[PDB]
């Protein structure tokens, strides 16, 4: 027995708040599209749907997987995530929003002390991928992507919710990466924080100062830092925690390539201010990226092909 429905997002937000003892085999979800198919309220992992191939990722929480659904054949990704560490706003934040910039889930499914969460397969794979495939991102590619990002975070601004977990393993790319869309709200929040990864964390997190919108400038900064060099802040200069290195050192600006054009520094300043209340909106950074990325003459660099050398 299952209580396992088709619906819309706002069912599944119900729902997903009453997921917030025993191991139990309870088996209740709202899936959002015809093509996943509930069978007589049921939809259990080797039953009605399966994973396959190596691993697709990490996300927040737990492993990201491809699936297939066994009777429509329909593939999709699947977050896998125990009871007790979900967080329901994952399930809440995005219910009602649609953007090109924000790949759309596509339902969820407890069963007993996991929840299954499904999402739109993306076969570009991730920004995080590209990075390492690639060594690092020339500076246009790295503008364009860093933009995209940015007009999804103004979506999400607009409405007072924070991404809360920024970073290239969490931003998906179409087959021909051309577009790129944020995932993963397992840290969101409806303006407590539930910090994300340590080296893109802001000031005023580490600060534990009131967080807002702000601290996804930060991170989307820390995020192009990365794609400029081909590895994260900080961590090519210092060693242990880097908790209080963040709230005490300069801003990391120093890592601004030298090869990068003044308003693609300027930018990256702006979005990296210690200060929440200097850093640019994503409104703001996302114009400035536009006016840089237009500075060096366009999107011209393809996707793939050459190998750049990131910091050693
Ligand atoms: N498709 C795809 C793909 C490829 C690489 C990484 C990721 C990725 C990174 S975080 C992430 N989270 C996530 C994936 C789900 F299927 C459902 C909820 C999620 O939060 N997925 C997805």
Redesign the pocket.
Request: charged residues 20%; negative net charge.
């Given at each position: 027995s299952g209580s396992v429905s088709s619906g819309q997002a706002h069912s599944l937000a119900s729902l997903a708040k009453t997921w917030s003892g025993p191991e139990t085999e309870d088996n209740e979800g709202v899936l959002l599209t015809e093509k996943l198919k509930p069978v007589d309220y049921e939809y259990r992992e080797e039953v009605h749907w399966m994973t396959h191939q190596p691993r697709?990722?990490?996300?927040?929480?737990?492993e990201?997987?491809?699936?297939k659904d066994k009777q429509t054949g329909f593939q999709?990704?699947?977050?896998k995530?125990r009871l007790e560490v979900f967080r329901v706003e994952?399930l809440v934040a995005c219910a009602g929003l649609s953007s090109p910039r924000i790949?759309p889930?596509?339902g969820?499914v407890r069963e007993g002390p996991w929840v299954n969460?499904?999402?739109?397969?993306?076969?570009?794979?991730?920004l995080?991928?590209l990075i390492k495939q690639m060594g690092c991102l020339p500076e246009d590619r790295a503008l364009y992507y860093l933009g995209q990002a940015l007009e999804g975070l103004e979506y999400l601004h607009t409405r007072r919710i924070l991404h809360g977990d920024v970073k290239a393993?969490?931003?998906?790319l179409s087959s021909d990466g051309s577009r790129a869309a944020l995932?993963?709200?397992?840290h969101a929040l409806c303006l407590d924080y539930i910090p994300g990864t340590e080296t893109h964390m802001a000031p005023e997190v580490v600060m534990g100062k009131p967080c807002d919108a702000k601290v996804d400038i930060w991170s989307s900064c820390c995020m192009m830092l990365h794609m400029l060099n081909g590895c994260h802040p900080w961590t090519q200069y210092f060693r242990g925690p880097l908790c209080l290195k963040i709230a005490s050192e300069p801003p990391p600006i120093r890592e601004i390539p030298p090869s990068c054009a003044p308003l693609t520094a300027q930018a990256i300043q702006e979005g990296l201010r210690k200060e929440p209340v200097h850093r640019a909106s994503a409104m703001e950074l996302r114009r400035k990226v536009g006016k840089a990325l237009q500075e060096v003459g366009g999107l011209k660099s393809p996707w793939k092909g050459e190998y750049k050398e990131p910091r050693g």
């Open positions: 697709v990722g990490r996300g927040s929480f737990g990201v997987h491809r699936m999709c990704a699947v977050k995530v994952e790949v889930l596509y969820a969460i499904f999402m739109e397969l993306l076969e570009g794979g991730s995080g991928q393993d969490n931003v998906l995932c993963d709200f397992g």
